[PDB]
């Protein structure tokens, strides 16, 4: 599960 501040916007990889 790839994490970064832009991926976080999809509210899944949190």
């Amino acid at each position, epitope marked *: 599960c790839e*994490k970064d*501040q*832009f991926q976080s*916007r999809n509210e899944r990889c949190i």
Partner: antibody
Amino acid sequence: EVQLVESGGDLVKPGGSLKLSCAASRFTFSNYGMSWVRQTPDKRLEWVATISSGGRYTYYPDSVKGRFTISRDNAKNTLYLQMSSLRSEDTAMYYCARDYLYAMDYWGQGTSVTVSS
Amino acid sequence: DVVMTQTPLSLPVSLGDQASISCRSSQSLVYSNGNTYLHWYLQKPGQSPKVLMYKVSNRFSGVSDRFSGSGSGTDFTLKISRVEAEDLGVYFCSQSTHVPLTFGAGTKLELKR
């Protein structure tokens, strides 16, 4: 007590190349996206690059896309920024930062880069 | 790119008093999922920035509850309820709704004496 320590800044001639490094400590580096942000002599901030936790994705603004390359070594807990085709407007203090949830929570104390003939 | 305009750019305030900073974006910061990715940072003198707030109103762990964030769309506010000497610095708003991530120019909090 997260810690980030940048190194590698220097004077570089226009058209030259330079590699910055950022040593991460006291957190599980592999679980977080990481970013570079620069602060120019006029004190403005400009986001430079981001890389996802596992290195699958990278992101850049047009001002550096193609010329700058972000990478990470999750075994060595280190972040890198390879800079090439350097321009005078790239002169700035460069900060490494940890992506935590939706923003960049902790930032290193920075390393200075000057591009001049 | 999204332009972030902060008001005021210089903010003199007395200790223990209230202060408020405005941040206006050149386009809406509402993301396709209806969330708003507007964040605030503080750069203390001689230091690098540190984050204060994320997604308009959420305090990061370790940030005093004297700080509050509010707003919607293009109009956002950071409020400090009782100013302390350690609040001295430059406050930056930032958006990540639209790539590239952008920052406002900074608002310098100054202590009156």
